Every structure is written in structure tokens, then in C-alpha cells.
């Protein structure tokens, strides 16, 4: 149980399936759609730009030596 549930791609569920699940999760949040008491939702999509392309081996090495 290294990688927690929240990491998507490897889950053993299909990308459309994943999407569907995400949607379900969003819906199933407790009183998420209320706009009465100034309730305000925000969804933040962003890309971790060059996430692999600037991993330093030193730091990476030490990190791995943890796991």
C-alpha cells in the first residue's frame, strides 16, 4: 500500500471508468451543490509541467532509499 487510492492512472479501472467514478465522488459529496449559505465549489485542473523532466537523481536516489 505505497500508492494511496487517490493516484489515478494505475488503479485497475478504465480511464472512462475513472472519470465516471470521479463524477460520482463529486456528486456524492455531502451537500456539494448548495448555493444557499454562500457555498462555492472550485475544481482545479492543472498539469505538473516537466514533472519527470526535472527530477534530480541525487534527491530521487535518497527518496527511493526511503521506500
Amino acid at each position: 500500500k505505497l500508492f494511496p487510492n487517490w493516484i489515478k492512472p494505475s488503479d485497475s479501472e478504465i480511464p472512462p471508468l475513472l472519470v465516471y467514478k470521479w463524477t460520482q465522488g463529486i456528486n456524492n459529496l455531502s451537500e456539494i451543490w448548495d448555493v444557499s449559505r454562500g457555498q462555492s465549489a472550485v475544481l482545479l485542473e492543472t498539469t505538473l509541467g516537466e514533472m519527470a523532466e526535472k527530477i534530480d537523481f541525487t534527491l530521487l536516489n535518497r527518496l527511493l532509499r526511503l521506500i
Binding site: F57, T58, N61, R62
Partner: protein, 81 residues
Amino acid sequence: PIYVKGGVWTNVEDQILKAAVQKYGTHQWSKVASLLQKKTARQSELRWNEYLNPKLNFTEFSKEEDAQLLDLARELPNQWR
């Protein structure tokens, strides 16, 4: 018989490769490979890069150089290239 390439660098073979390199230069590795019936292009190029090229050195390291090395190991962990 046709087969998959590999094996070990016999001295004659090495010499031949060197000759080829003199002839065709360090970026036509296909031709040089072809010249050697046993060894591949990639293999050849690697060999040239690693062992055979004269602008490398295999002289032992001075104490200062040893220090530099081991210090590098300490600081850059096993990024040996």
C-alpha cells in the same frame, strides 16, 4: 549460419574496428559493423566509445584524483556517467 550478434572482442577484431574508425570516422557505425562479421553496429560504437578510443585514459588516479572520485560518489550517488 545466420544468427544474433554479440560475443567478446578478440584483439584482431578490435584492431580491425580501429582501422575502420580511422577510415570511415566515428559516425558511420553501420559500415564498421558490416566490416566485422561477428559484432553489431551498436556494439561497435559502444566499444569505440568505452574502450578503444585513444582520447580516453586508463592511467591510475592520483591521491587527489581518488579524493575527487570518492567525493563525487559521496555527493553524486551512482550517476556514474
